[PDB]
Amino acid sequence: GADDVVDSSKSFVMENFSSYHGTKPGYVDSIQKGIQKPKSGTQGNYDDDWKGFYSTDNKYDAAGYSVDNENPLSGKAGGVVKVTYPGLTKVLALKVDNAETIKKELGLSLTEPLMEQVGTEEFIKRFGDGASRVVLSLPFAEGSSSVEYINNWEQAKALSVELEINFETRGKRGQDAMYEYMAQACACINLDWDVIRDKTKTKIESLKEHGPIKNKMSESPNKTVSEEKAKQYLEEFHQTALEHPELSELKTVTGTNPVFAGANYAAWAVNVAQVIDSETADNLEKTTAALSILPGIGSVMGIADGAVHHNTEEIVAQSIALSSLMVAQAIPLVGELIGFAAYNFVESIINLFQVVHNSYNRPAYSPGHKTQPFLHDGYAVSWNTVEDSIIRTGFQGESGHDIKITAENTPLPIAGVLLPTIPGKLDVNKSKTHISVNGRKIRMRCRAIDGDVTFCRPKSPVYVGNGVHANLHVAFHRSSSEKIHSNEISSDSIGVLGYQKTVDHTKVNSKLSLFFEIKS
Ligand SMILES: Nc1ncnc2c1ncn2[C@@H]1O[C@H](CO)[C@@H](OP(=O)(O)OC[C@H]2O[C@@H](n3ccc(=O)[nH]c3=O)[C@H](O)[C@@H]2OP(=O)(O)O)[C@H]1O
Ligand SMILES: [Cl-]
Ligand SMILES: [Cl-]
Ligand SMILES: [Cl-]
Numbered sequence: 001g002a003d004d005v006v007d008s009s010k011s012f013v014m015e016n017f018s019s020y021h022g023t024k025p026g027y028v029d030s031i032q033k034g035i036q037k038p039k040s041g042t043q044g045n046y047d048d049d050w051k052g053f054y055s056t057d058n059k060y061d062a063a064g065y066s067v068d069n070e071n072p073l074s075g076k077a078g079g080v081v082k083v084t085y086p087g088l089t090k091v092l093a094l095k096v097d098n099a100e101t102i103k104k105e106l107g108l109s110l111t112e113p114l115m116e117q118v119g120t121e122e123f124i125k126r127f128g129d130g131a132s133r134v135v136l137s138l139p140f141a142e143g144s145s146s147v148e149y150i151n152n153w154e155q156a157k158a159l160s161v162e163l164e165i166n167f168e169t170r171g172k173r174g175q176d177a178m179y180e181y182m183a184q185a186c187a188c189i190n191l192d193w194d195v196i197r198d199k200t201k202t203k204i205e206s207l208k209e210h211g212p213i214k215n216k217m218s219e220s221p222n223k224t225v226s227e228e229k230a231k232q233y234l235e236e237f238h239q240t241a242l243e244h245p246e247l248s249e250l251k252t253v254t255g256t257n258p259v260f261a262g263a264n265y266a267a268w269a270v271n272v273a274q275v276i277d278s279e280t281a282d283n284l285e286k287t288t289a290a291l292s293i294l295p296g297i298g299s300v301m302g303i304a305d306g307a308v309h310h311n312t313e314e315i316v317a318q319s320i321a322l323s324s325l326m327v328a329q330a331i332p333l334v335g336e337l338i339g340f341a342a343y344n345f346v347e348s349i350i351n352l353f354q355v356v357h358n359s360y361n362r363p364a365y366s367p368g369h370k371t372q373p374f375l376h377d378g379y380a381v382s383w384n385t386v387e388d389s390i391i392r393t394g395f396q397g398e399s400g401h402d403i404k405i406t407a408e409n410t411p412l413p414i415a416g417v418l419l420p421t422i423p424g425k426l427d428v429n430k431s432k433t434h435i436s437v438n439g440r441k442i443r444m445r446c447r448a449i450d451g452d453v454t455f456c457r458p459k460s461p462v463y464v465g466n467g468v469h470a471n472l473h474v475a476f477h478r479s480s481s482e483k484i485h486s487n488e489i490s491s492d493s494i495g496v497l498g499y500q501k502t503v504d505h506t507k508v509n510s511k512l513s514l515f516f517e518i519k520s
């Protein structure tokens with residue numbers, strides 16, 4: 001019955017029920033003319049049961065859906081709109097997010113999509129408590145206290161749409177306006193990136209005119225040399241530059257934590273020059289993709305031991321300037337590309353600071369592993385609960401699986417995840433599969449790869465560390481009644497891909513695996 005799948009304590013009828021929707025560039029104006037199902041696309045979900053218009057009670061979470069899907073890491077953010085139903089609306093809160101279970105327990109048709117039925121007159125009379133329409137609600141994410149609203153497409157035409165914020169109107173660089181907005185949530189780190197950009201140029205220029213530095217420059221091989229030679233020279237360059245007036249604050253703090261040492265700045269610069277080729281250097285989105293999967297970014301951001309130490313514009317600018325200068329020195333030694341170092345390197349790395357600062361500005365998601373974790377390259381991954389490790393052979397409709405992901409200290413990236421499938425019968429719901437980082441829900445882009453495996457990459461950069469923890473939520477969809485056998489699946493693990501490293505003179509991603517148990 002209804003009390004099997006409805007949370008009455010979270011269900012209610014409200015007048016002028018409002019919620020928020022994150023909107024992409026190109027749509028902030030047009031969406032205010034009305035909510036309408038797009039002619040094509042997933043129209044809200046991979047799964048027909050879940051097709052509808054999606055909103056949330058939290059405008060900062062809505063903002064997290066506003067970035068240009070063609071350029072999800074570095075692209076422009078559109079805005080947030082507030083959608084309001086006139087009259088009375090029933091919010092129907094669900095205790096499960098399994099459509100088959102919900103259709104069974106609410107005595108619905110098992111052969112019509114759930115969200116379609118939600119907008120029928122019969123459903124609304126049965127479950128509306130007098131309201132003009134029903135909206136379903138679900139918890140937004142692990143690590144979040146926000147709510148997700150799922151609106152029937154035809155009923156959603158009744159919505160009135162107002163502007164909450166248009167990020168582009170602010171006329172700021174990169175994703176700055178979006179991240180300043182999100183920081184209001186907290187207050188907290190809320191730096192002025194315009195000031196940091198200018199301080200960084202002023203410091204760069206300052207350093208290039210420094211006697212001992214440009215003399216140090218003169219000593220560079222200025223040619224392809226080994227990684228060892230390159231790192232050695234760069235450590236020396238760092239020592240030299242750190243003595244400079246404009247980096248005085250940086251020098252003081254530098255001895256204070258091993259994370260901030262020159263060796264680490266040099267390793268970073270080396271790694272950057274190694275992965276940025278001409279095509280990549282010429283494209284901010286590609287640059288950010290490449291930088292986002294490197295290890296060691298905690299050194300330049302001054303993040304260690306659960307805290308953000310580089311928490312002023314001045315010291316962030318000092319750190320960014322020094323790293324930029326070092327990247328320029330490394331490119332001839334090991335890279336192969338002029339101007340990337342003070343432009344796209346700086347714009348890309350600013351975006352990643354913004355991401356990690358936004359995570360530290362959020363409450364730390366449930367830090368302890370609740371099952372014994374798998375430990376590798378500084379990461380720790382565990383099944384959230386034993387049940388998450390089991391694929392029930394007779395499951396109906398869909399199944400969700402939670403995996404906790406942490407890292408021991410500095411921020412370490414999650415490049416993607418490797419999910420097992422079964423030819424037809426068991427597929428990844430690419431809409432409901434996501435990663436939540438201290439409650440920030442990050443959508444994924446998923447594609448098939450060899451061996452009945454689907455690879456999903458987060459839309460926005462994922463980092464975990466001390467104080468920044470994630471939940472990987474895998475949503476499987478059953479696309480066939482035909483039963484699943486315990487020996488039918490080609491892959492029996494979920495893979496987690498970490499930072500890029502070199503093995504056998506080749507770039508590979510750190511890999512961690514958790515194994516599923518298939519049983520009745
Ligand atoms: N006039 C319009 N009426 C309706 N939609 C319009 C209109 N104009 C533009 N859109 C966009 O069209 C899509 C469907 O509503 C959404 O964008 P998306 O980029 O596909 O949105 C990307 C994904 O984000 C989800 N998402 C988006 C924002 C939000 O706050 N929460 C959320 O969960 C979407 O449901 C979508 O899921 P699926 O990709 O799984 O379908 C939406 O912003
Ligand atoms: Cl999105
Ligand atoms: Cl989650
Ligand atoms: Cl605005």
Ligand SMILES: [Cl-]
Nearest residue numbers: 509510511512
């Ligand atoms: Cl590995």
